[PDB]
Amino acid sequence: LKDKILGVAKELFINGYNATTTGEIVKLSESSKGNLYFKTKENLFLEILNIEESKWQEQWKSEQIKAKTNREKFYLYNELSLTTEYYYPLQNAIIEFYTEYYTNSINEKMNKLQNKYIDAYHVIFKEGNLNGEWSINDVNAVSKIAANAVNGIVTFTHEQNINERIKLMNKFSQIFLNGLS
Amino acid sequence: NLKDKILGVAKELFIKNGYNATTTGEIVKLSESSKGNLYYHFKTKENLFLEILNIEESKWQEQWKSEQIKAKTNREKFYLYNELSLTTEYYYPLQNAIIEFYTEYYTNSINEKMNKLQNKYIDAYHVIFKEGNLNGEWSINDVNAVSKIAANAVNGIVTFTHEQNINERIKLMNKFSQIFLNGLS
Numbered sequence: 001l002k003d004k005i006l007g008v009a010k011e012l013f014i015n016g017y018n019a020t021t022t023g024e025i026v027k028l029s030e031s032s033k034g035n036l037y038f039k040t041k042e043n044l045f046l047e048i049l050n051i052e053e054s055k056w057q058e059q060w061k062s063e064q065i066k067a068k069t070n071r072e073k074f075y076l077y078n079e080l081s082l083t084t085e086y087y088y089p090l091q092n093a094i095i096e097f098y099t100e101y102y103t104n105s106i107n108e109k110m111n112k113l114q115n116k117y118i119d120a121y122h123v124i125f126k127e128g129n130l131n132g133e134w135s136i137n138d139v140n141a142v143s144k145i146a147a148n149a150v151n152g153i154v155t156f157t158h159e160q161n162i163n164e165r166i167k168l169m170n171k172f173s174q175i176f177l178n179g180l181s
Numbered sequence: 182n183l184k185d186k187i188l189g190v191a192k193e194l195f196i197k198n199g200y201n202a203t204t205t206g207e208i209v210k211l212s213e214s215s216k217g218n219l220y221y222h223f224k225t226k227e228n229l230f231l232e233i234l235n236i237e238e239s240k241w242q243e244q245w246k247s248e249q250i251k252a253k254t255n256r257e258k259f260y261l262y263n264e265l266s267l268t269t270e271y272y273y274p275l276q277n278a279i280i281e282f283y284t285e286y287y288t289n290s291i292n293e294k295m296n297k298l299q300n301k302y303i304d305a306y307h308v309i310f311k312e313g314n315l316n317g318e319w320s321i322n323d324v325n326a327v328s329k330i331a332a333n334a335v336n337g338i339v340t341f342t343h344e345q346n347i348n349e350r351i352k353l354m355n356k357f358s359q360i361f362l363n364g365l366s
């Protein structure tokens with residue numbers, strides 16, 4: 001029954017973490033105070049990141065076959081990253097959470113959510129070493145970089161023409177990938 | 182000095198209490214000023230904050246100009262700048278008040294000046310890349326884009342890697358600086 005609440009949450013969060021609150025989440029939704037018990041707010045929010053992280057991650061599975069090689073897949077995952085409505089449009093809300101509501105158990109809990117977000121790149125780079133497109137020496141490192149680099153392009157340019165955004169991402173994808181060969 | 186005092190008191194107020202918490206009345210009283218003189222200079226708390234952010238911006242470029250003497254070549258400069266940016270986040274106090282503000286207003290009016298404010302930060306790369314071209318450290322026939330990219334690539338690495346110990350994160354950032362810079366030839 002209580003799956004309805006998440007829609008108002010995902011919606012509201014993408015106003016921010018601070019601005020949205022347990023009151024708004026219930027009253028603007030119609031559900032008892034107790035019924036919402038994921039116990040804490042940071043347990044609710046952290047749950048939403050997974051449903052959106054998964055949604056994106058299965059959209060990428062459904063769209064990546066168009067990329068024939070791994071080199072194309074890298075370009076594409078980064079392009080698609082800009083256009084998706086999953087995960088990446090919450091990233092602002094995380095930055096607040098990252099640097100405010102962080103209990104020590106929450107840190108370790110959502111580190112698994114981090115490792116999920118790199119595995120897109122981990123698979124790609126490993127497969128490149130396999131399919132013979134390049135030779136990475138420390139992949140899990142190079143993935144952490146490519147990912148966070150990319151997240152940077154996506155998040156910190158949410159205020160200009162979308163055709164341009166894609167061009168800058170493409171250029172990055174090209175530079176980065178070339179730095180490995 | 183009543184303008185500068187307000188900015189100065191506002192800053193330390195924001196640092197201690199955060200954007201949303203700090204009130205105009207507090208700023209007014211503690212700087213021994215008046216709501217009028219505040220409205221005259223700044224109009225809104227929204228704007229006052231931007232002026233602080235611009236003062237700090239200039240302190241940064243001032244700081245950089247001094248620190249970059251340490252790095253001889255433009256290759257070295259690029260490495261060092263990206264490091265400095267990474268180390269910063271750990272102890273910059275306005276950090277938290279900036280995240281509040283940034284998310285509370287990104288209004289096409291307020292967002293206008295926030296963009297103009299990042300262009301000064303991008304101009305740092307723009308120089309490094311430009312000057313590297315002239316000494317022949319690389320060939321970039323498109324210095325403005327690659328500047329935009331580098332800026333946001335670094336900022337992404339700084340901001341979205343708040344789990345590891347500082348040793349590891351400097352190791353990553355330099356590995357990025359290595360890969361990126363390498364793939365320009």
Ligand SMILES: CCNc1cc2oc3c/c(=[NH+]/CC)c(C)cc-3c(-c3ccccc3C(=O)OCC)c2cc1C
Nearest residue numbers: 234235237238240241242244269270273301302303340
């Ligand atoms: C020892 C002095 N250390 C400094 C450290 C700083 O760290 C910053 C970290 C950040 N971390 C991510 C949230 C963001 C956004 C801005 C920062 C600024 C900053 C603030 C206002 C305007 C521009 C900048 C800025 O960095 O750009 C200047 C060109 C900043 C400024 C100074 C002086």
